[PDB]
Design a protein around this ligand. Structure first.
Ligand SMILES: Nc1ncnc2c1ncn2[C@@H]1O[C@H](COP(=O)(O)OP(=O)(O)O)[C@@H](O)[C@H]1O
Lengths: 360, 37
């Protein structure tokens, strides 16, 4: 009887030792007041560095005992106190997985790439890019210098983002990709820090491929007036070039870029020897469109027919990426007639609207 | 089992002292946070 009255107590106490340690933890943190964030321009001595805060100024500072003066160099991100302004700690890996993300299975060496439209391209990039990566100890002794970089231009609405994503995945290369928007959309004046990190991260995961679209955004002014307000639109080209020159072009890192307006490109660089090989790309033809429509339309409950042949012969003057719309241009009429298995009548009048959609 | 309650009441008298003690150090911190909140 008088045993259970105690047995609830050994439970009681341990149910407080948990509670206590928490309430004693937090006060152990509140004294540790906040800090301030900066970035470095250069270096002068182990007793004096330079910084650049995240609220303007370019202070001069010293440094604490603990942190290795070795790791402190240019480009690094930094933290320090508010009054004395002495640097203590570092945080690398300015993560932004919305920006980039790896494809490790792209290092599979047997991956699938069977969408339609284009064969000699995927055939030739295999020539342009495979050999300098797998056993490139020959390009030197033969004599030539391989291409540091590539460029892939064409018209819009063609679905090439998935292409370069694919062919580096069958070959067995570690693929990563980041648009040139968020690096200048999310990050107005803290951008090029991401660039160099995007390579160092890429280095120690060698070999690897790059891909990056909307590349015509780095230009901005392109020194359209030489005012000191577009330093972001200027330097963001600079750090790009200085870094890609630093590869040595050995055969464990290569680069891809793309846009629609190469005539709008910035040949201040990326023309002569950096993006040496320029490669245009075509549109479909009398059977490619069935090689395409066999992809999207195949993935939905139609009736099952081959009006494609008699269809595309009616089609002409036809870009590429309008095809996810063309099926769904018909899907918006099957449901209207309260259907499940559509007919080609929706397809025979599908484009009949879409051709006028190209007008504007 | 007479010696039971002459003994197993003693521990009960102890853990009450153990409980009210730990009950207060948390009350102490419980107020601190409000002072710094
Ligand atoms: N050859 C193709 N095969 C399959 N889908 C394609 C093809 N070309 C374009 N598309 C479609 O277009 C879209 C991708 O185009 P997108 O990547 O935006 O081109 P770009 O990168 O030139 O802007 C996808 O919805 C895709 O289904």
């Amino acid at each position: 009887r008088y045993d259970d009255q105690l047995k609830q107590r050994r439970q009681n106490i341990r149910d407080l030792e948990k509670l206590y340690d928490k309430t004693e933890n937090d006060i152990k943190a509140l004294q540790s007041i906040g800090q301030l964030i900066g970035e470095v321009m250069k270096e002068l001595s182990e007793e004096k560095y330079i910084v650049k805060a995240s609220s303007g100024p370019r202070y001069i500072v010293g440094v604490r005992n603990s942190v290795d003066r070795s790791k402190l160099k240019k480009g690094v991100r930094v933290t320090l106190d508010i009054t004395t302004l002495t640097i203590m700690r570092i945080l690398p890996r300015e993560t932004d997985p919305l920006v980039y993300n790896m494809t490790s299975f792209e290092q599979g060496e047997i991956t699938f790439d069977g969408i339609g439209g284009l064969t000699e391209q995927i055939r030739e990039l295999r020539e342009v890019i495979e050999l300098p990566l797998k056993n490139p100890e020959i390009f030197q002794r033969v004599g030539i210098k391989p291409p540091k970089g590539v460029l892939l231009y064409g018209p819009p609405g063609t679905g090439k983002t998935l292409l370069a994503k694919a062919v580096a995945a069958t070959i067995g290369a570690n693929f990563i990709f980041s648009p040139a928007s968020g690096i200048v959309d999310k990050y107005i004046g803290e951008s090029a820090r991401i660039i160099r990190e995007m390579f160092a991260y890429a280095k120690e995961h060698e070999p690897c491929i790059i891909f990056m679209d909307e590349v015509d955004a780095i230009g901005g002014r392109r020194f359209s007036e030489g005012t000191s307000a577009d330093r972001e639109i200027q330097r963001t080209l600079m750090e790009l070039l200085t870094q890609m020159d630093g590869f040595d072009n050995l055969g464990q890192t290569k680069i891809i870029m793309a846009t629609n307006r190469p005539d709008t490109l910035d040949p201040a660089l990326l023309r002569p020897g950096r993006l040496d090989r320029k490669v245009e790309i075509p549109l479909p033809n009398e059977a490619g469109r069935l090689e395409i429509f066999k992809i999207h339309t195949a993935k939905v409950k139609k009736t099952g027919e081959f009006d494609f042949e008699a269809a595309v012969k009616m089609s002409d003057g036809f870009n590429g990426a309008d095809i996810r719309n063309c099926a769904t241009e018909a899907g918006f009429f099957a449901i209207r007639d309260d259907r499940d298995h559509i007919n080609p009548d929706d397809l025979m009048k599908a484009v009949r609207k879409v051709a006028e959609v190209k007008k504007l | 089992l007479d010696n039971e309650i002459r003994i197993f009441r003693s521990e009960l008298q102890r853990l009450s002292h153990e409980n009210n003690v730990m009950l207060e150090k948390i009350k102490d911190n419980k107020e601190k946070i409000k002072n710094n909140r």
